[PDB]
Design a binder for this molecule. Structure first.
Ligand SMILES: *[C@@H]1O[C@H](CO)[C@@H](O)[C@H](O)[C@H]1NC(C)=O
Ligand SMILES: *[C@@H]1O[C@H](CO)[C@@H](O)[C@H](O)[C@H]1NC(C)=O
Ligand SMILES: [Cl-]
Ligand SMILES: [Cl-]
Length: 200
């Protein structure tokens, strides 16, 4: 299944001409047309939402923000964390801490005005987002990567205690996903060792 959000397909299927989010190409919950928006950096505006409200994000920070957009919109497994009473929303998707930490590090000197990027905006007539709070650095907005990942999208994400049973929006998620859906920990960690070996 896919999420029952604005843009999602009914069911995951291959998607040949994706411009971004290609991690999900051969089984995607987004149509390729959605990806066109993300093909060019700097990314100013995705759908009705401006990404540059406190300035233009550094490239690596933008990359991380794009990875989460691609997951929500295109991952064939996001719906496994579907909120049953709000079918466009996810809850408690387990993110790897290393992922959240690298992200924070990438964004630490960038600026932001929404502690929670989903709720903390003024939305105008045309659906476009405007800061209410003040622009501050990410390093002021959140105390660390963990705090950021638990805050940015409310209940959507959590930070796993496990370094293996967690998503980081790269090919290793194929290892994680097998075990997410003590024992499972060791299974995952062995599987992950094989993965790292196979990739030269
Ligand atoms: C994207 O394509 C799908 C089917 O190919 C279509 O249903 C949808 O309206 C398109 N979205 C936009 C924004 O053009
Ligand atoms: C991260 O920051 C939060 C909030 O300040 C704090 O509780 C926590 O100890 C810090 N470290 C981790 C790994 O969460
Ligand atoms: Cl196409
Ligand atoms: Cl990529």
């Amino acid at each position: 299944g896919c999420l029952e959000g604005d843009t999602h397909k009914a069911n995951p299927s291959p998607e040949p001409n994706m411009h971004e989010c290609t991690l999900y190409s051969e089984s995607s919950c987004c149509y390729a047309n959605f990806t066109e928006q993300l093909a060019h950096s700097p990314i100013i505006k995705v759908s009705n939402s401006y990404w540059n409200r406190c300035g233009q994000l550094s490239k690596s920070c933008e990359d991380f923000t794009k990875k989460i957009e691609c997951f929500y919109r295109c991952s064939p497994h996001a719906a496994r964390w579907i909120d049953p009473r709000y079918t466009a929303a996810i809850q408690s998707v387990p993110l790897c801490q290393s992922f959240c930490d690298d992200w924070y590090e990438a964004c630490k000197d960038d600026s932001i005005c929404a502690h929670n990027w989903l709720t903390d905006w003024e939305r105008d007539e045309s659906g476009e987002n405007h800061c209410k709070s003040k622009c501050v650095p990410y390093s002021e907005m959140y105390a660390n990567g963990t705090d950021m990942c638990q805050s940015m999208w409310g209940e959507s994400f959590k930070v796993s205690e496990s370094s293996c049973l967690c998503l980081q929006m790269n090919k290793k998620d194929m290892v994680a996903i097998k075990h997410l859906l003590s024992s499972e920990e060791h299974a995952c960690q062995k599987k992950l060792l094989k993965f790292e070996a196979l990739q030269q």
